[PDB]
Design a protein around this ligand. Structure first.
Ligand SMILES: NC(=O)C1=CN([C@@H]2O[C@H](COP(=O)(O)OP(=O)(O)OC[C@H]3O[C@@H](n4cnc5c(N)ncnc54)[C@H](OP(=O)(O)O)[C@@H]3O)[C@@H](O)[C@H]2O)C=CC1
Ligand SMILES: COc1cc(Cc2cnc(N)nc2N)cc(OC)c1OC
Ligand SMILES: [Cl-]
Length: 159
């Protein structure tokens, strides 16, 4: 079972200049809760944005180039990434844009953070038909001292 987890601003913006154009410690907490002790598949741009391994998860990096960090697992293809996860209940695909594009069709589950922010972006979450998806869980949160935007945590299931 392949799952995507992503945080979407207004207009499906997920990124700008190899970072997320916001600062939502509550989102990173949600991300950590839902990824801990599961394999994570990320693209090389995302790996470099994060800048260090994600503790409690097998870190699988997609890159056509040879690896540059002995602590994580490097793969050269989707099929290799997926085999590198092994026999697990849930594969977590954690970004970015190009990687989401490739796994969304294989994905059974979406973990979305809807962020109330109209921010400039160079990377967007892939388009998809919502007819194909059923909302399972949502949870709304007001902005606070540490989170300048309101947000909603939603889980969706294919059909
Ligand atoms: N809002 C959110 O939830 C999140 C936001 N982001 C944002 O996403 C953006 C980055 O996304 P994007 O630019 O698409 O890049 P990605 O992070 O998806 O990484 C792309 C790179 O991954 C490698 N790669 C991807 N697919 C393959 C494949 N099939 N075979 C081999 N190598 C592959 C390549 O590395 P190489 O070039 O070395 O071959 C490619 O250049 C950033 O702005 C980041 O902040 C990311 C995570 C979460
Ligand atoms: C833990 O820190 C990061 C995590 C992520 C991935 C990510 C973050 N939030 C959500 N909701 N989904 C994701 N896939 C992406 C990041 O930057 C691109 C991070 O660095 C701040
Ligand atoms: Cl690519």
């Amino acid at each position: 079972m392949i799952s995507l987890i992503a945080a979407l601003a207004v207009d499906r913006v997920i990124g700008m200049e190899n970072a997320m154009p916001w600062n939502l410690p509550a989102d990173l907490a949600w991300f950590k809760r839902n990824t801990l002790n599961k394999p994570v598949i990320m693209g090389r741009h995302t790996w470099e944005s994060i800048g260090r391994p994600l503790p409690g998860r097998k870190n699988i990096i997609l890159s056509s180039q040879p690896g540059t960090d002995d602590r994580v697992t490097w793969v050269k293809s989707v099929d290799e990434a997926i085999a590198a996860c092994g026999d697990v209940p849930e594969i977590m695909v954690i970004g970015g844009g190009r990687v989401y594009e490739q796994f969304l069709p294989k994905a059974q589950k979406l973990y979305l953070t809807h962020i109330d922010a109209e921010v400039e972006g160079d990377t967007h979450f892939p388009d998809y038909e919502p007819d194909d998806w059923e909302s399972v869980f949502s949870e709304f949160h007001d902005a606070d001292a540490q989170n300048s935007h309101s947000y909603c945590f939603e889980i969706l299931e294919r059909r």
